[PDB]
Amino acid sequence: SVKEFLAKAKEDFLKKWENPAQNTAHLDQFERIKTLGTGSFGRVMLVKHMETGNHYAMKILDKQKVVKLKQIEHTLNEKRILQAVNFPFLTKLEFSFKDNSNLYMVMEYAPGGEMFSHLRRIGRFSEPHARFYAAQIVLTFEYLHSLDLIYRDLKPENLMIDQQGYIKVTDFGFAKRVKGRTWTLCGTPEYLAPEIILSKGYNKAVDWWALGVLIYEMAAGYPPFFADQPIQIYEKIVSGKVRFPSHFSSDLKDLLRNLLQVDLTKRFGNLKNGVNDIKNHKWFATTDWIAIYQRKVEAPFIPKFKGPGDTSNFDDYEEEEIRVSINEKCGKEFSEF
Amino acid sequence: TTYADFIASGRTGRRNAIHD
Numbered sequence: 001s002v003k004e005f006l007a008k009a010k011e012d013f014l015k016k017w018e019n020p021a022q023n024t025a026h027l028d029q030f031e032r033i034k035t036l037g038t039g040s041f042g043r044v045m046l047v048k049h050m051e052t053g054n055h056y057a058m059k060i061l062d063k064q065k066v067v068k069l070k071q072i073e074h075t076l077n078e079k080r081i082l083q084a085v086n087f088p089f090l091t092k093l094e095f096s097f098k099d100n101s102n103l104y105m106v107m108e109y110a111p112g113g114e115m116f117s118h119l120r121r122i123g124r125f126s127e128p129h130a131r132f133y134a135a136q137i138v139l140t141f142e143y144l145h146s147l148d149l150i151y152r153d154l155k156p157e158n159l160m161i162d163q164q165g166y167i168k169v170t171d172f173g174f175a176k177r178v179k180g181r182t183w184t185l186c187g188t189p190e191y192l193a194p195e196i197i198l199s200k201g202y203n204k205a206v207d208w209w210a211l212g213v214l215i216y217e218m219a220a221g222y223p224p225f226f227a228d229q230p231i232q233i234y235e236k237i238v239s240g241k242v243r244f245p246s247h248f249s250s251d252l253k254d255l256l257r258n259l260l261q262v263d264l265t266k267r268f269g270n271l272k273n274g275v276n277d278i279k280n281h282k283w284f285a286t287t288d289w290i291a292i293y294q295r296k297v298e299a300p301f302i303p304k305f306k307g308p309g310d311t312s313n314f315d316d317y318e319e320e321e322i323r324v325s326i327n328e329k330c331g332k333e334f335s336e337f
Numbered sequence: 338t339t340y341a342d343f344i345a346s347g348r349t350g351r352r353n354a355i356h357d
């Protein structure tokens with residue numbers, strides 16, 4: 001049963017949520033190999049865990065920079081959620097720790113690269129290819145939302161491809177445990193629900209809207225609302241108009257009309273029957289939900305294995321020292337980390 | 338074409354999160 005599985009997952013989550021793992025490794029247990037991606041207050045590096053020889057992705061945040069960007073609470077959210085959570089289609093937190101200068105989150109390494117890189121190169125995904133990925137997101141949101149978590153940053157840049165060609169959602173820097181509504185202006189312009197841009201209190205429905213943006217982008221090769229500047233994107237998102245490619249199937253267009261619905265009483269995922277409205281839509285008729293969860297379905301794209309520690313599916317970034325001050329920074333701000 | 342306008346836009350690279 002889905003209800004039964006969720007019930008026991010929430011039991012597992014709550015224990016870890018209320019008593020979070022802390023200080024479970026140290027920087028010099030890892031060999032730093034290469035930068036896999038960059039962000040505002042931090043980067044992500046391929047590292048090797050020397051004691052086991054396992055490869056991992058280590059997220060490094062400069063505490064001083066987190067503070068300047070007013071992301072203290074959000075960073076504490078990210079770590080506290082990721083250590084508590086456990087689901088096949090999320091990058092699992094293996095270790096976390098901090099030193100005088102930085103915060104560290106060590107997650108499983110997905111060597112396939114970002115969906116973003118593959119989507120841009122290939123141009124667009126076929127509907128079966130798009131549906132495969134979409135299903136994995138549908139299930140991840142079902143899991144997360146059942147734990148009262150909102151994700152708030154769905155986009156291809158945040159979806160890593162694993163050696164089996166399945167997805168891992170990563171970057172929980174805006175994820176939050178909220179019962180009820182919340183107000184923070186955050187996310188990525190192309191993927192923002194109308195609620196958010198109009199400064200309403202909002203809820204998990206914004207994640208289902210974001211799913212509609214992603215499915216569209218995967219299947220079209222470009223997003224449903226784009227312009228050169230964010231303001232122009234926001235004017236389009238709140239206009240209530242959306243244009244589908246002629247190659248989009250009837251089923252696709254109708255799923256997206258119900259996902260990209262400005263009206264919350266009508267938006268799929270946010271209705272009385274919740275996520276099943278999405279799972280039982282015709283576009284997903286071919287989808288064996290349990291076989292996807294079980295990773296039994298054959299991936300439409302299996303990434304090139306060139307060994308462990310291969311990074312050829314990721315772009316190159318300018319490498320930058322991990323400097324560790326002799327003085328502790330922001331001890332109080334990050335005490336619970 | 339819509340594809341052409343996208344590819345010619347400034348937002349075909351990785352997109353950064355916003356914040357208030």
Ligand SMILES: Cc1n[nH]cc1-c1ccccc1
Pocket residue numbers: 036037038044057058091107108109110111160170171
């Ligand atoms: C966490 C992670 N696991 N595998 C790859 C990862 C990332 C994450 C952010 C950016 C680049 C690469």
